Every structure is written in C-alpha cells, then in structure tokens.
C-alpha cells in the first residue's frame, strides 16, 4: 500500500545472496549492463560533446 | 588579621537548613506516635537505609 | 564603555547561596570544640575527598577505641546511632555505635576533629566531610600517622584484589588461621634460601639495604608441574610474614589499568608481600607492560612479589626478569612425612604407620596426600578402620 | 600557583580570604597519588593571591552547588601587557620545573595519563658499565644535541631532531643507561609507556605533550610492543617535525 | 465538564521564569545599538547554535580588524578582557583583547550585531549567543558572506582531519613554507598533465566546466614502489594551489562515519584539494562505501581528491574508479639533479660535483638522496670535507 | 668471581650481589662460588 519498486546494483553478481533472485517479491529479473559496442560509444561521444572540437570523421575514428 | 572579601552578615533565618524542617518534624511526630502506642522511646538508626533485605521482609 | 545591565542590587542580594547554613554550622562546631577542649579548631578541608583516615575514624568509633571522642550531634532529629551491618560485604558486622554522619568527633591529643555534616539533595541524604585541627603542625603529624596505622591494621588481615570490568575490587579478610614457619612444607635448602630474603625484608632492621646499596624490593617466581601445591605453599609462606599480605587475582578483566591500580594499592601497604598466583593466566597483551613495572626505568620499591606458574616458559621469556625462579617438585619421602604429621594423620595412625605411609607414597602430590587423608579419615571415622596400605595401593592404580 | 604556594616561594603573596568560615588552610596530601605530600599551607580555594612583580592575581572563589562545594577560578591582571607577559612566561617556567621531574605518559582506555615523579633510585653516568667508546659516543650525541648550537640545522634546513635505538638482551644496562640521563642533562626527560590501549589517538597526545617540553629527551621503552595498527601513524607523527 | 484544579492565579504568578532578566538585556542591547548607530537592531537568534561566523567574530576581534566595533559590556563586573591562550592547542596564541563573552559587537556596515550574554548555571558560567540585524536583507547578505570569508582564510592554512574514536578532529596549521610550482620534483610530462586539471579547477575561471558540461570534481591516485617520496610530492603539489588544502589522516578509527564527516567538512571549503595519504591503510569494511562517495548516485562536487598508495591492487579493485592513476617511479638522472639543487647540495659542491652525484645515484630514492644530503652535510660541516663519491659508494653497499 | 661469571648479565651479577651480601650479613661468610653454581643451576 502501495508498492515498493526495488532496484539493486552490484559490480559483483557472484557475491549476491542467491535468495534475492528469481522470486516475484525480491528481485525477479536481472539485467547485465556491459561495455558499450562501437555504435553506442559513438552515440555517447556525440551527446557528451566531442563534436565541439572533433570533426565528424575524427569522432567516428 | 587577614581581610575577608565577603562581608555580608546573615540574618538568623538564613541559617535554616534545606529540607530539615520537614524531615525533623516528621521524625519527631513518628517518635511521639510510637511513644503514644507503646510507651517506649524509639530513635533513628538509619535515616535512609540502603539495606534492602529486612525491608523486603 | 556603556553597561547593558543597570539594575542595582539590594544588599540582601549579595548573599551567597548555601553559605548561611554552612558558615553557621562551622562556627558552632568551632564554638562547641572550644567549650569542651579549650582550644580553637580551624577548618582544613570543607568536603574532604580523602577516605583513608575517615575510614580509620569509623573503625575507631566502631571498635570502642578510647582515642576518638564524641563531641556533639549536628541535627537533633537526624540519626544519633548507626550500625556497621551492610548486606553487600562477605562478612557482616553487627556492631551498633554512635553515628558518624550527624556527629562531631575529636582526637584531642592529636588536635584533629571530624564532622560529617548531613544535607538533603536529589533526593538522598548526603554529607560534607569536614576536617578541623588546632594548628598546622598537629594537622601534619596526624596525616603522617595515617599510613603507619593502616600498616599495623593490615598486618592483621589479608587483602584480595580481584580484577573486574570497571577496575579492581579490594576485599579485606580476617586471618582466621595463623601460620608458623614450621608449617611451610618445602625443600629445606630452598626454604632456607628464600627466608634469607624474607627475614631481611620484613623481620629485620632496614639498614641492610642502605649498607650494601641494594634496591628494597624483590620478585621471585615459583614454578613446577601441576598439582605440586604451589598455591598452598605461597599462602603458607605469606602467612608466616609479619607484614600485610595482598593477593592479586588475575582474571579475564586484567589489563594494564588493573595492574597499575593493584600495584599502587599494594604499595600503600609497603612493606608488603604481594602474591600473584598463576601469573600465566594473564592476557598476553599486558605481559610486556607487566614485566616493566617490576624492572623498568620507573619501577618502584617496597614490594616483595611472589608469583606461581605452571608454564615458566610463558611468563618470563628470558628463562630472566624476576630475581629468582625456584622449581617446586613433588615431595620426596621426608617432605611427605612432614606433611602427614602437619595434616593430622597421627590422629589415626601410629608413628610406624606414618613412616610407612610416607615410604609408600612415592610420586604422590600434596593434593593426593590430602585426598588420601580425607578418604582415610572417613574409614577410621566410619569403620574404625583406616586401611591406608590398601588405600594407597588403590589410589595409585 | 599551587606549587609556588606549597613550596613557600616568595611570590605569590596571600592577599585575603574570601569567606570567613570556609577553609583557610589545606594540605597537599592526596591518597590517590603515588608520592604523598604532607605539606600544610594556606588554602587555594577561598583565597586571593597576587604576584605583585608580574601584575597578575588569582582568586579561587568558592560556591555551593547541588550540595557540593565548587569554585570559580578568577584571573586578574593590572593591564594587557602584564597579562600577556605572564602568559608568555608559563612554558619556560614549566620547562625549568620539568628538568627536576621525570614525566611518564601511560596509555589508558580513554587516553594517556601524565605523572611527574622523581626517580626512585638516581643513577650517575659513572655507574653505567659499558664499553667506554660506546658510552662516550652515546653521551656525546645527547650532549651535542642540547648544548652545541643549532648552527648546523638552520644552515642546512635540516629538522632539529635525532633518535637512537638501544637494543640487546635484557639486564645489561639499557635501563641503567636511560636512567643516567635524567640527572645528567639540562633538559627534561619524558618516558612513554606503550600499553594495549596505545592508539593513534594516544600517539598524538604524547608527542603534543612531549613537544611542549622541547628541548627534551623522549624515551620509549620496548618500542617493539607498539601495536601493528598504529605503527604507520607513529611513523607519520615522527616525520611531522616541530623543531 | 468539571475542573479538579480551581485555584485562582494572582496576576504575579503569570510571569515567565528567566524572561524578566533576558527581555531586559535584549531591550537594553537594542537601546544601546540605537544610541550609537541610529538604527534599530532586531533579534534573529536568541541562542545561536551556529559557530562559523561566531568564530569569524572572535578572530576579527583578536586580530585587531577594523570591521567589528565593541559597543558595550553587559555586566560591569564580569570580564572586559580575555586572551586567546588555550593550553590544549598545538600552537599557543598569546593575544590579549576585549572579551567576547560579556560584550556586544556590531558590524555597522553589515548591519549585524553580536552579544554573548553571560549567566550562571551548574555551576559554571555559560552564555546565550544572540544575533541581531537591522533588517532581513542585511541578515541574509551577512550569512551569504560567511563561506567566502572562511574560504579566503583557509587558503592561508592547512587543515588536518585525524579520525578518532568519537569522530574526526579538525586542526588548522600555519603555512610556514610556501611551495612554488618549480619545486615539485616529478616526471615533467606527467606534471604537465596533472596541472592541466589543477589549473583549470583552481586557477582559472570556472566557466570551462559549464561550457563542456563536465562535473566539477576530480580524483587522482598516485602510486608506486615504497620510498619514492609520494607523500612529500602530494604535499608539494598541494602547497602550489591557491585554495584551502585539507589533509585526511586515516587511522584505525576510520569508519563510514568519519568519512562522511571529513568530506562534509572539506566540502565546506570547496573548491579545496583533499589529500588522502596511504588510502590503503583504511579498513576493508568501509572501502566499498568510500568509493561510492566519489562516484555513487549521490556523490558531490567541489573537491579535488589526491590519494597515495603503495598497493594500487587493494584500493581501486578495477585496476578503475578514480579518474586517473599515475605511477611515481624512482627518479631518473635529471630528476635526481633537480632534487639536489632544490635540497641544497650546491652549498658544498661545485656544479660538476652535482652533475656527477646525480650520475652516480642510479637507483636512489628521494629519501636516500635526502639521507645522503644530511650525512654529507655533517662531514662538510664537521671535517670541511664532503666525500660524496665515497659516501654514495658506501651507501649503495 | 669475574672469571667464574662468564656469560652473566649485569642484572645477574646484581642478583649475585644481593645473595652474597645476605649470606655475609647474616652468617659471616659469603659462599660466593656456591652461589655462582646455584645460579647456573
């Protein structure tokens, strides 16, 4: 009354209490947040502002 | 003859001791009451006894 | 230059709180002492934190000594009587006597007087301990006399220090059993040697120490296999010494703090013997500090330390920092025989039976000879029959 | 002030008593102190004292509070320049007095405890039996450090400090060598007692107190028994040079 | 409906305890401020818990600043003078000046006034800290000005936080030695790189951070083999920065509680550099929490952190959560040579001798070059002879 | 006695001194060599 949404974070999934996971209460889904691929790196550099001093080709490189 | 800094002199009712007026009156009345019922003289052996054993008896 | 507060005080507002009652009592205590003794006592401590000579006062009053005289009660309706009985002490004292609180006492030859002045606060009854004297020279001689009185009184007692979580607990105990030197059952050659130190330290004139320029202290370690009666021996040695004896009980609460408390408290009874049984039971993190109190740059005098250990290895890693370490083995035949006469085998055995029983008890500890005594005693007291040869052979097997 | 009064020193001068019926005399005797002092003298509580030549006076004004007896410690001066000069003279005075005391810091549960004792048995240098060239050099570095001038340490911007470590099997004159120093040098000597309560908090208190005594000698017996979780902190404290 | 208590109060019994004295003092403080400045000051804090600007007041009075004016004493017979001298601080201050307690001060241009009103209780002398202002706009501008004054003052000082059992202890220290950038002996290429961040963060306009949308904070880790002088380097870098410097001394008392205290106290001096030496000495149970304060969802701005470690392995397990980690190796020949000119070898050696000594000191730490300096100095100061080639060859062996 | 005490510390020589002195003071002779052996014992 009415609803807690929990978000847990870890850089060490191995050290997690396994009781936490795959229950509807507690944490029912887990997602891996991994290193960005090239398309995502290029996306990050643009929004970050590398375009202020880098050309469209320098950023792609 | 070394001087005294404090020279105020005390009126006689400034010597009264805090709380003794109530306490001594009570003790006195308890002694008179005990005398009225038993004809013997009781006095104080402890004004605030810390022993608990015979008090719990 | 300006002043914010410009209110002008009536002279009645200059009065000091509490002083009107207190100054009145002090004046009356002095008037009363003059009326009785014809001299002028002066205040030397208005609420004395010292407890030593105040405890001497109470014991003097309690024990009916002639020296302290009851001079006056303070408040007519507070206690005029009290009693020693405190349910928290091991040995109750049922003595009834004149109160200390609410009283004025004087040591008229000494020129020193005492008043424990009651007052009410939060919400109990407390007191100001007030000390008076006729002049500075008498006050000083009284103070100088405190320690020698405490010393004489503690000869007649044994003081146990038990270390606890807050600090050490001091406990005085009656010398119910006096111990003659002939009851110390021990290797004769080493008994002789130890008592050379003891007799010089406690039972002689102290000039020896100044003549040879020898620090006035000693520390000996008594060690050996378990069950060799080391503890009963040290108590027996301690009981033969005409000086206060203090026992220090190491516990799991022993720290470098309890150590300093105990040594400062024993040192107040100097010269005193300080018994430390199973010094190997003390925590390893204070042992470096402990051995420094006995031999460091700021170690002090007046104490004859006697410790016992089963693990000489762990106490004095230099084995050496005690003055001497003596091994107490199991008793040989003549020691076993002294033991049996002292413990009372002669009650139920002939001399031949004792001599024989000493001979058959090879390898027996003092404890085992004791357990033999109790078990052999029942039989003689139950069956009219002792059966020692049967009982030694049965106890060995 | 108390020690000046207790010892019969010429200043301060007793000026007045405050309350006619509070104590006029006291005595130094404190049963919770290892050295019993039996001196009787004029009371501090309930008195006014003046140092006429310094222009500073003292009154320990008694009052009653929750039954018990307390005091305000009131300080008076003739003017600001007298007050400052008096304050500026305090640590040179304590310095001198500490030459004729030994200071011992003993680490307890809260923190360290300071006690000023006189040595139970004094020890001259001639009673230290040792290889003469070892003796000579150990005494020479100590004696050079306090009585040569610091022309060296200022010229080369070198912090004015030194430490030597004495080691060997026990009972061969280390303690005796140390005790020979208190009598023998014109500077205070302090001993630091490491205990199981020794902490970084304990190390700070000691060096702050020791540096207030400087120039002085600081003795650390059994430096091996310093606990492991404070050793690094101890090294940092040594480095932080108050010269 | 009935009322048990039916007693009817005299109007004299409506009076509020303590208010008659206090309201009278406040009225008089206001009357006196009007008489002197011609404006009306109002109470804004009757017993102000804030200490920051009250400490600025005291330092202003102590240092003879013109800005705060002494307006009045409160009680004619309480102190009118005081002194800074407190025996508990490392550096004594002997300044004598007008009292703060028992005084009224005003910052008349600022429109803010201060009164520390004495009173007696249990049993000491305490005070109400009272803050006055002529209107709300001046009061606010005064508060807004506190932090910039504290900032300027702490540029001129170094603040050490030492973690203890209760909490962290703040200690301000004089900048006895100023440090020019040319005295930072360090790899030149990496010196250049670090100072790009430092100069932007501290010695430029802050618009850079808004132009590129870059968080205004930094954390760098300095690591390397022991004895490489990492600590002397970080102090040298810190001393070249025109901003308050704070040192955080991890102890065995460091917890997640001291961490938050230290970071909140440093953050009050923002922008500030915060030095953390041997971050590897901190307890392993707070390290997860610690790295979160630098990069977590609620990490804050304004601090330039500089840590040192010998075990980069243990601090930042991702080795990475500091912004950059720089290795400080042993000095090569040109660094050894800069060191020797800065430390003062040129006192007793020719330039050829320095160049040579830099050349022979391969593998030397900065500490070792230092220990070489002291030992070589005595000889030149003792024997008129330095003998460096002999001393380097003897120190290597 | 200096020869017989090879390997002694000063503190040990001091314990030797107290023990001899006690013997001398109480009985009129010192027994110095016995005590040296007692202490190696």
mmCIF file with all atom_site columns, N, CA and C in Angstrom, chain C residues 333 336 340 352-364 369 372 388-393 396:
data_model
loop_
_atom_site.group_PDB
_atom_site.id
_atom_site.type_symbol
_atom_site.label_atom_id
_atom_site.label_alt_id
_atom_site.label_comp_id
_atom_site.label_asym_id
_atom_site.label_entity_id
_atom_site.label_seq_id
_atom_site.pdbx_PDB_ins_code
_atom_site.Cartn_x
_atom_site.Cartn_y
_atom_site.Cartn_z
_atom_site.occupancy
_atom_site.B_iso_or_equiv
_atom_site.pdbx_formal_charge
_atom_site.auth_seq_id
_atom_site.auth_comp_id
_atom_site.auth_asym_id
_atom_site.auth_atom_id
_atom_site.pdbx_PDB_model_num
ATOM 1  N N  . UNK C 1 333 ? 60.508 -38.336 50.318 1.00 0.00 ? 333 UNK C N  1
ATOM 2  C CA . UNK C 1 333 ? 59.970 -39.092 51.449 1.00 0.00 ? 333 UNK C CA 1
ATOM 3  C C  . UNK C 1 333 ? 59.884 -38.249 52.725 1.00 0.00 ? 333 UNK C C  1
ATOM 4  N N  . UNK C 1 336 ? 56.996 -35.738 52.410 1.00 0.00 ? 336 UNK C N  1
ATOM 5  C CA . UNK C 1 336 ? 55.733 -36.460 52.551 1.00 0.00 ? 336 UNK C CA 1
ATOM 6  C C  . UNK C 1 336 ? 55.425 -36.755 54.004 1.00 0.00 ? 336 UNK C C  1
ATOM 7  N N  . UNK C 1 340 ? 52.391 -35.388 56.479 1.00 0.00 ? 340 UNK C N  1
ATOM 8  C CA . UNK C 1 340 ? 51.413 -36.236 57.153 1.00 0.00 ? 340 UNK C CA 1
ATOM 9  C C  . UNK C 1 340 ? 51.295 -35.915 58.641 1.00 0.00 ? 340 UNK C C  1
ATOM 10 N N  . UNK C 1 352 ? 54.961 -45.674 63.297 1.00 0.00 ? 352 UNK C N  1
ATOM 11 C CA . UNK C 1 352 ? 55.351 -46.649 62.295 1.00 0.00 ? 352 UNK C CA 1
ATOM 12 C C  . UNK C 1 352 ? 54.457 -46.608 61.075 1.00 0.00 ? 352 UNK C C  1
ATOM 13 N N  . UNK C 1 353 ? 53.148 -46.459 61.291 1.00 0.00 ? 353 UNK C N  1
ATOM 14 C CA . UNK C 1 353 ? 52.222 -46.378 60.165 1.00 0.00 ? 353 UNK C CA 1
ATOM 15 C C  . UNK C 1 353 ? 52.462 -45.120 59.327 1.00 0.00 ? 353 UNK C C  1
ATOM 16 N N  . UNK C 1 354 ? 52.832 -44.003 59.970 1.00 0.00 ? 354 UNK C N  1
ATOM 17 C CA . UNK C 1 354 ? 53.123 -42.767 59.234 1.00 0.00 ? 354 UNK C CA 1
ATOM 18 C C  . UNK C 1 354 ? 54.385 -42.927 58.409 1.00 0.00 ? 354 UNK C C  1
ATOM 19 N N  . UNK C 1 355 ? 55.473 -43.323 59.075 1.00 0.00 ? 355 UNK C N  1
ATOM 20 C CA . UNK C 1 355 ? 56.735 -43.595 58.400 1.00 0.00 ? 355 UNK C CA 1
ATOM 21 C C  . UNK C 1 355 ? 56.529 -44.504 57.194 1.00 0.00 ? 355 UNK C C  1
ATOM 22 N N  . UNK C 1 356 ? 55.757 -45.573 57.387 1.00 0.00 ? 356 UNK C N  1
ATOM 23 C CA . UNK C 1 356 ? 55.450 -46.491 56.301 1.00 0.00 ? 356 UNK C CA 1
ATOM 24 C C  . UNK C 1 356 ? 54.679 -45.790 55.199 1.00 0.00 ? 356 UNK C C  1
ATOM 25 N N  . UNK C 1 357 ? 53.649 -45.028 55.572 1.00 0.00 ? 357 UNK C N  1
ATOM 26 C CA . UNK C 1 357 ? 52.809 -44.385 54.569 1.00 0.00 ? 357 UNK C CA 1
ATOM 27 C C  . UNK C 1 357 ? 53.584 -43.326 53.789 1.00 0.00 ? 357 UNK C C  1
ATOM 28 N N  . UNK C 1 358 ? 54.511 -42.631 54.449 1.00 0.00 ? 358 UNK C N  1
ATOM 29 C CA . UNK C 1 358 ? 55.410 -41.746 53.718 1.00 0.00 ? 358 UNK C CA 1
ATOM 30 C C  . UNK C 1 358 ? 56.233 -42.534 52.706 1.00 0.00 ? 358 UNK C C  1
ATOM 31 N N  . UNK C 1 359 ? 56.653 -43.745 53.094 1.00 0.00 ? 359 UNK C N  1
ATOM 32 C CA . UNK C 1 359 ? 57.506 -44.571 52.250 1.00 0.00 ? 359 UNK C CA 1
ATOM 33 C C  . UNK C 1 359 ? 56.755 -45.101 51.032 1.00 0.00 ? 359 UNK C C  1
ATOM 34 N N  . UNK C 1 360 ? 55.463 -45.412 51.175 1.00 0.00 ? 360 UNK C N  1
ATOM 35 C CA . UNK C 1 360 ? 54.681 -45.984 50.082 1.00 0.00 ? 360 UNK C CA 1
ATOM 36 C C  . UNK C 1 360 ? 54.107 -44.947 49.135 1.00 0.00 ? 360 UNK C C  1
ATOM 37 N N  . UNK C 1 361 ? 54.215 -43.661 49.451 1.00 0.00 ? 361 UNK C N  1
ATOM 38 C CA . UNK C 1 361 ? 53.532 -42.627 48.688 1.00 0.00 ? 361 UNK C CA 1
ATOM 39 C C  . UNK C 1 361 ? 54.435 -41.996 47.645 1.00 0.00 ? 361 UNK C C  1
ATOM 40 N N  . UNK C 1 362 ? 55.378 -42.766 47.111 1.00 0.00 ? 362 UNK C N  1
ATOM 41 C CA . UNK C 1 362 ? 56.253 -42.241 46.076 1.00 0.00 ? 362 UNK C CA 1
ATOM 42 C C  . UNK C 1 362 ? 55.425 -41.716 44.907 1.00 0.00 ? 362 UNK C C  1
ATOM 43 N N  . UNK C 1 363 ? 55.861 -40.592 44.342 1.00 0.00 ? 363 UNK C N  1
ATOM 44 C CA . UNK C 1 363 ? 55.146 -39.960 43.256 1.00 0.00 ? 363 UNK C CA 1
ATOM 45 C C  . UNK C 1 363 ? 53.865 -39.256 43.647 1.00 0.00 ? 363 UNK C C  1
ATOM 46 N N  . UNK C 1 364 ? 53.546 -39.169 44.940 1.00 0.00 ? 364 UNK C N  1
ATOM 47 C CA . UNK C 1 364 ? 52.313 -38.534 45.390 1.00 0.00 ? 364 UNK C CA 1
ATOM 48 C C  . UNK C 1 364 ? 52.461 -37.012 45.432 1.00 0.00 ? 364 UNK C C  1
ATOM 49 N N  . UNK C 1 369 ? 48.123 -36.598 48.653 1.00 0.00 ? 369 UNK C N  1
ATOM 50 C CA . UNK C 1 369 ? 48.232 -36.940 50.065 1.00 0.00 ? 369 UNK C CA 1
ATOM 51 C C  . UNK C 1 369 ? 47.066 -36.365 50.857 1.00 0.00 ? 369 UNK C C  1
ATOM 52 N N  . UNK C 1 372 ? 44.075 -38.513 50.023 1.00 0.00 ? 372 UNK C N  1
ATOM 53 C CA . UNK C 1 372 ? 44.274 -39.717 50.825 1.00 0.00 ? 372 UNK C CA 1
ATOM 54 C C  . UNK C 1 372 ? 43.809 -39.500 52.254 1.00 0.00 ? 372 UNK C C  1
ATOM 55 N N  . UNK C 1 388 ? 45.202 -47.884 55.186 1.00 0.00 ? 388 UNK C N  1
ATOM 56 C CA . UNK C 1 388 ? 45.989 -46.992 54.334 1.00 0.00 ? 388 UNK C CA 1
ATOM 57 C C  . UNK C 1 388 ? 46.728 -47.776 53.247 1.00 0.00 ? 388 UNK C C  1
ATOM 58 N N  . UNK C 1 389 ? 47.489 -48.813 53.626 1.00 0.00 ? 389 UNK C N  1
ATOM 59 C CA . UNK C 1 389 ? 48.186 -49.630 52.615 1.00 0.00 ? 389 UNK C CA 1
ATOM 60 C C  . UNK C 1 389 ? 47.245 -50.090 51.503 1.00 0.00 ? 389 UNK C C  1
ATOM 61 N N  . UNK C 1 390 ? 46.027 -50.485 51.869 1.00 0.00 ? 390 UNK C N  1
ATOM 62 C CA . UNK C 1 390 ? 45.025 -50.823 50.866 1.00 0.00 ? 390 UNK C CA 1
ATOM 63 C C  . UNK C 1 390 ? 44.621 -49.590 50.060 1.00 0.00 ? 390 UNK C C  1
ATOM 64 N N  . UNK C 1 391 ? 44.506 -48.429 50.722 1.00 0.00 ? 391 UNK C N  1
ATOM 65 C CA . UNK C 1 391 ? 44.045 -47.211 50.051 1.00 0.00 ? 391 UNK C CA 1
ATOM 66 C C  . UNK C 1 391 ? 45.141 -46.554 49.210 1.00 0.00 ? 391 UNK C C  1
ATOM 67 N N  . UNK C 1 392 ? 46.412 -46.600 49.641 1.00 0.00 ? 392 UNK C N  1
ATOM 68 C CA . UNK C 1 392 ? 47.474 -46.078 48.777 1.00 0.00 ? 392 UNK C CA 1
ATOM 69 C C  . UNK C 1 392 ? 47.570 -46.927 47.513 1.00 0.00 ? 392 UNK C C  1
ATOM 70 N N  . UNK C 1 393 ? 47.623 -48.261 47.678 1.00 0.00 ? 393 UNK C N  1
ATOM 71 C CA . UNK C 1 393 ? 47.655 -49.171 46.527 1.00 0.00 ? 393 UNK C CA 1
ATOM 72 C C  . UNK C 1 393 ? 46.423 -49.023 45.648 1.00 0.00 ? 393 UNK C C  1
ATOM 73 N N  . UNK C 1 396 ? 46.906 -45.446 43.792 1.00 0.00 ? 396 UNK C N  1
ATOM 74 C CA . UNK C 1 396 ? 47.867 -45.471 42.689 1.00 0.00 ? 396 UNK C CA 1
ATOM 75 C C  . UNK C 1 396 ? 47.234 -46.108 41.452 1.00 0.00 ? 396 UNK C C  1
#
